């Protein structure tokens, strides 16, 4: 399954900030609140704001920052890449033990989907290789962020800001770091081609070995650059070395090396799957993580 | 449009780990009481749980014990009184749903929330999970204005791999029983009010390549739907896609007719919101709740 980490720790730091007429959802952490910056947007200044002006003209008693309907005092307010930064008089007693990281294209997390700072639902996304995500946002879950849980620690890597015209979100990092070629400003913009998740898909095949599904494993070897040449002629992924090292523990589990297994899937692209399945489909999966595919045996 | 699961934290709140002797799974607390599945007390349930002390029970909530002053049976669930309430319970309901229903399973091990997805109870009143050692007590719920009900408490994988379970007052869906035990289910059968949702669902998503210019009557549907092992599709199921229908201005049947297409030629390598299979898990509420 595609399976979300549990909400709750997420869910305890959700907020609204209104600015004027406009309300998106912020993220409250000790005793700042972060949230996009287009937030102090008007709706005739979004073809292409000019942030830092119109910054100039907002202050602390501007923002209305509510956690429900009680109103958080903002104290001072700063901008930083395209987040605001709202400090706030009150330190957030359900705040977890959280980072803010960076995630890299085919690494997974755990969307919560807020409307008015109140939470709607909870999914998994992919970071796909031209840094869209397929997300399902309406109006109003700007803010929204997404995150992934280890040992209870909440590493914050996504905060939603924008669809795309073919119906893909766009968002920057909680510095506020657009992932990917995108701006926040009201304008279509479009994402490169996309491509499939090799390490991803590897790892696919790997949960497929676990599983007793092994007919697509072969006698052959390579090397990763001549798979990486052969791979983005059939619109895969290159690898990279830390792709290889994250293979490391399904390696070794079967002891199929990650060569090997490099080989086994360059035969199935060249030669299809010949109407045969891999854990009962057709189609390669590739929004499953080497750690997602060991968490679901574990 | 994504398979979307409730937000899990007012359930989190309620979980537990109920230990006897070698035996733990996870437990669920609200108020003063702990339900949990009753084969915690195995190594004849009336005669061994006649045998069994309170102090034979070690809960845990987190890293504090809770005392446990008092204990019954209620179907397949254990309940099991203790001296302390959860301050976290949420406003909640015990509710038995309906095959073709959706709801949040939250996952757990140890008493601790692990994962948290979408499941629906199939017809034959199993649930398609993700569940390992360890998960027996999981509960799946639905949320509605920050009132949980609970639907299920999990305690079984049968050999296919789908699982079974009870509702929160112990009683299976379906016709399994909690013992050590291969058992197989009914003949699964696809959710068609589910998979009419759905192509709805892909007609507000801006995907319409398998609509058709052709209309069919309820009853020549029924027949077809039934031939491929589908659910009949009754007129309360017409009525309950109503607003679907309204939005996207397609009659029930003008889908129906759809499916039927779809059903006889197949989706011919193409596919609906990603899928290459017609997905029976979304409820014309999930479609909505999502869309709008
Ligand atoms: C002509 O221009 C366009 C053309 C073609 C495609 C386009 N796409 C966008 C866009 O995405 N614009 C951002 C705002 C800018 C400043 C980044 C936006 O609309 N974000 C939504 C979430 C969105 C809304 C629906 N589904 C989502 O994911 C917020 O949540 C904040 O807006 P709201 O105040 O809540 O309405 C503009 C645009
Ligand atoms: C001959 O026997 C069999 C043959 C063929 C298929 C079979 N299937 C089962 C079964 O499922 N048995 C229940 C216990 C009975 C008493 C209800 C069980 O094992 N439930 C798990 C969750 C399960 C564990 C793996 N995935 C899950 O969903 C708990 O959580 C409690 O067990 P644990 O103490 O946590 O290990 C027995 C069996």
Same mark, same amino acid.
């Given at each position: 399954?595609?399976?979300?980490?549990?909400?709750?720790?997420?869910?305890?730091?959700?907020?609204?900030?209104? /600015?004027?007429?406009?309300?998106?959802?912020?993220?409250?952490?000790?005793?700042?609140?972060?949230?996009?910056? &287009?937030?102090?947007?008007?709706?005739?200044?979004?073809?292409?704001?000019?942030?830092?002006?119109?910054?100039?003209?907002?202050?602390? &008693?501007?923002?209305?920052?509510?956690?429900?309907?009680?109103?958080?005092?903002?104290?001072?307010?700063?901008?930083?890449?395209?987040?605001?930064?709202?400090?706030?008089?009150?330190?957030?007693?359900?705040?977890?033990?959280?980072?803010?990281?960076?995630?890299?294209?085919?690494?997974?997390?755990?969307?919560?989907? /807020?409307?008015?700072?109140?939470?709607?639902?909870?999914?998994? /996304?992919?970071?796909?290789?031209?840094?869209?995500?397929?997300?399902?946002?309406?109006?109003?879950?700007?803010?929204?962020?997404?995150?992934?849980?280890?040992?209870?620690?909440?590493?914050?890597?996504?905060?939603?800001?924008?669809?795309?015209?073919?119906?893909?979100?766009?968002?920057?990092?909680?510095?506020?770091?657009?992932?990917?070629?995108?701006?926040?400003?009201?304008?279509?913009?479009?994402?490169?081609?996309?491509?499939?998740?090799?390490?991803?898909?590897?790892?696919?095949?790997?949960?497929?070995?676990?599983?007793?599904?092994?007919?697509?494993?072969?006698?052959?070897?390579?090397?990763?650059?001549?798979?990486?040449?052969?791979?983005?002629?059939?619109?895969?992924?290159?690898?990279?070395?830390?792709?290889?090292?994250?293979?490391?523990?399904?390696?070794?589990?079967?002891?199929?090396?990650?060569?090997?297994? /490099?080989?086994?899937?360059?035969?199935?692209?060249?030669?299809?799957?010949?109407?045969?399945?891999?854990?009962?489909?057709?189609?390669?999966?590739?929004?499953?993580?080497?750690?997602?595919?060991?968490?679901?045996?574990?």
């Amino acid at each position: 399954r595609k399976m979300a980490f549990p909400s709750g720790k997420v869910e305890g730091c959700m907020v609204q900030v209104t /600015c004027g007429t406009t309300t998106l959802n912020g993220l409250w952490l000790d005793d700042v609140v972060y949230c996009p910056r &287009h937030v102090i947007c008007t709706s005739e200044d979004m073809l292409n704001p000019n942030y830092e002006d119109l910054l100039i003209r907002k202050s602390n &008693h501007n923002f209305l920052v509510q956690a429900g309907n009680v109103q958080l005092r903002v104290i001072g307010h700063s901008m930083q890449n395209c987040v605001l930064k709202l400090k706030v008089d009150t330190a957030n007693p359900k705040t977890p033990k959280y980072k803010f990281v960076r995630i890299q294209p085919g690494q997974t997390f755990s969307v919560l989907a /807020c409307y008015n700072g109140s939470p709607s639902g909870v999914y998994q /996304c992919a970071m796909r290789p031209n840094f869209t995500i397929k997300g399902s946002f309406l109006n109003g879950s700007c803010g929204s962020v997404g995150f992934n849980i280890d040992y209870d620690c909440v590493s914050f890597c996504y905060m939603h800001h924008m669809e795309l015209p073919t119906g893909v979100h766009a968002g920057t990092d909680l510095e506020g770091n657009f992932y990917g070629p995108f701006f926040d400003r009201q304008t279509a913009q479009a994402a490169g081609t996309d491509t499939t998740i090799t390490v991803n898909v590897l790892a696919w095949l790997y949960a497929a070995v676990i599983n007793g599904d092994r007919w697509f494993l072969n006698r052959f070897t390579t090397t990763l650059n001549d798979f990486n040449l052969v791979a983005m002629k059939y619109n895969y992924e290159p690898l990279t070395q830390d792709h290889v090292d994250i293979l490391g523990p399904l390696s070794a589990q079967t002891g199929i090396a990650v060569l090997d297994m /490099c080989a086994s899937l360059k035969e199935l692209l060249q030669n299809g799957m010949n109407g045969r399945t891999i854990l009962g489909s057709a189609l390669l999966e590739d929004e499953f993580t080497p750690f997602d595919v060991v968490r679901q045996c574990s």
